[PDB]
Design a binder for this molecule. Structure first.
Ligand code: NAD
Ligand code: NAD
Lengths: 352, 352
């Protein structure tokens, strides 16, 4: 099966691509415009495969995307390209509106023409799988708002949308566009919403990687506000496996939430990392001593937690890692990958 | 209070402007780019008021919109400008995406900067009122599916978003942007979702106007499916009153559903108009004789119905009209405004 993937040089995207090439019979054409977020080095031990093809393009460029579809005759699409940085363009567009909304619209129109011009067989098997975030659901009650032993609510596929940031609002919109094209034109679409990913090849400035690296450089490990914030951490390699499962076995018109089956406070994440770093790599003092509390960010969602029961029940997917086993692997990865980290920090990675 | 309004030359927009000038102490600056949908003639008996100002501009034009805010220093904003025709683009984003989504984003950014630079007093009183549709809610169970006297569901402010067309998807997105700006930047925003509007100044090709005009012209009154579709009809003048009520008394961060407190099948609408045209402008033969059956559009939402209890309970608003009294006023209006109708049909209205 040939899978056309957008955002393939990204954090999650690269995990998806590496998975398909290393563990499946499928082939992939990766469409990525390589913004500051893309990294071809994250695909380095896969880019020589004859089952992999790279196309340097912007999903907003219809002409180019149309060409690529016509040339590769994809059996399915996995849409991961997105802008997570909220900017403020002078002239016009803010990249996140352009890429996340207009880009999804643009891609949907190319895929619609392509799909409708297919033959009965290939047309009934085609799938447009849209990758999204749990942030579209808004916020959940926090443990300290609900008093003693009351079972807290979880995000399910029928939880109402309630975006609270420009980024999540832009993703919620792309979600709506994907579902409307299905109901209006009959396009084969599927939508998945996942929680926070962590793991190998995550950029240096991200939360978990930042704690691990600052720890090592003898710098401040920040805990924001009370370290209050609750998030459901999903290991990237697990997300990657769920996504391929969904695109190949997912049912058109369905939605699937994906999560790591856990819930953790930021403070717990920082401490867990320090404990691992004390076990592996011991030193003259505990890494804990660099922990420092810092600024809180205004009206931020207090708790995200996903109920992944549906995907388990219907497709049989469950994470293979636990936060414990996953975090350990992550720390080990950063310790063994200084080169990759340094190329990102120096900018060297943007030279292909 | 100076109210800045977008889409003021449109169907609903013109009703809002006329209402503020005829029945309030407030002043208004109307920003409209005058697409095929705008009609300055609909504002003719109000355009000379010194309390009214017109600005010919596109909401996507940030420089222009910024100048306008700075010049009129608005106490509030009523955003009604939107593109309801779903077109396609041989060059990037279609109009509805540009106007409904990007345009709302653009407007939000100008209003944010303006608002944050106000002055404690005027800054706490400022309001950004976003006008939207009940279509964002998806579809409701139809009478013929929910057997016997069960009782059917209604759209409430907490009903889950589930857009099923490109248009409704674009409006649902503008809604998400509006709320995120509030939660993220603290912008005073409000959102209202209303049902199908009908009444004076509704373009000739619209459903109700078309039935009235075709009927008198003696032409056929075609019905699509079994005339199954159910909709909540809200008289435009009623909507106009609710909107002003909301912008002046509405609470920041709140959502209000607005409807005509009714539910009607299309077949009932056609029959109701024929009955009235038989009463007024009586004809030996009955106007139903003209009713005929054609085919109908695929997978369309079967039932929209709004629960307008919250706005009643909290702001004390209720429709003054009933579907019956309102349809009567509408028929009388068309019979009395051949000139307006003909100027729209000929294109002459687009000469200012
Ligand atoms: N990181 C997370 O925890 C997370 C959690 C939930 C959902 N998601 C979703 O997963 C998807 C991928 O997330 P990620 O963290 O790996 O993103 P990322 O920032 O790591 O990568 C985005 C990729 O898309 C590319 N890109 C950006 N704009 C583009 C455009 N206009 N045309 C083509 N390519 C473009 C970038 O060059 C990059 O390779 C997104 O859609 C995101 O919303 C991410
Ligand atoms: N007609 C209905 O039944 C209905 C029902 C529910 C919600 N709504 C909402 O009410 C609002 C107004 O509806 P309507 O039927 O009166 O619309 P309309 O089509 O009659 O008028 C739209 C107006 O906006 C202007 N406009 C379009 N694009 C613009 C742009 N980029 N910049 C500035 N002005 C622009 C047009 O010139 C026109 O005067 C919309 O936001 C719509 O979603 C309408």
């Amino acid at each position: 099966m040939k899978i056309l993937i957008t955002g393939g040089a990204g954090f999650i995207g690269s995990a998806v691509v590496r998975h398909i090439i290393k563990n499946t019979q499928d082939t992939v054409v990766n469409i990525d415009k390589l913004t500051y977020a893309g990294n071809l080095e994250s695909l380095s031990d896969i880019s020589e495969s004859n089952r992999y093809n790279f196309e340097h393009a912007d999903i907003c460029d219809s002409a180019e995307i149309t060409r690529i579809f016509e040339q590769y005759q994809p059996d399915a699409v996995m849409h991961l390209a997105a802008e997570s940085h909220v900017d403020r363009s002078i002239t016009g567009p803010a990249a996140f509106i352009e890429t996340n909304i207009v880009g999804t619209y643009a891609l949907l129109e190319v895929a619609r023409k392509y799909w409708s011009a297919l033959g009965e067989d290939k047309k009934n098997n085609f799938r447009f799988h849209h990758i999204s975030t749990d942030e579209v659901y808004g916020d959940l009650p926090h443990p300290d708002e609900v008093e003693n032993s009351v079972t807290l609510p979880l995000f399910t596929e029928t939880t109402a949308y309630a975006p609270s940031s420009p980024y999540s609002a832009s993703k919620a919109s792309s979600d709506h566009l994907v579902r409307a094209w299905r109901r209006t034109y009959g396009l084969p679409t599927i939508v998945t919403n996942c929680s926070n990913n962590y793991g190998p090849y995550h950029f240096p400035e991200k939360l978990i990687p930042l704690v691990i690296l600052n720890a090592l450089e003898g710098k401040p490990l920040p805990i924001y506000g009370k370290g209050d914030q609750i998030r459901d951490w999903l290991y990237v390699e697990d997300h990657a496996r769920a996504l391929h499962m969904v695109v190949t076995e997912g049912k058109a018109g369905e939605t699937y939430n994906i999560g790591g089956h856990n819930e953790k406070k930021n403070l717990d994440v920082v401490f867990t990392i320090c404990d691992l770093l004390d076990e592996i790599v011991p030193k003259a003092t505990s890494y804990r001593e660099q922990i420092t509390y810092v600024a809180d960010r205004p009206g931020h969602d207090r708790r995200y937690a996903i109920d992944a029961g549906k995907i388990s029940r219907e497709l049989g997917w469950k994470p293979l890692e636990t936060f414990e086993s996953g975090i350990r692997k992550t720390v080990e990865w950063y310790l063994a990958n200084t080169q990759w980290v340094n190329n990102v920090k120096s900018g060297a990675y943007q030279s292909w």
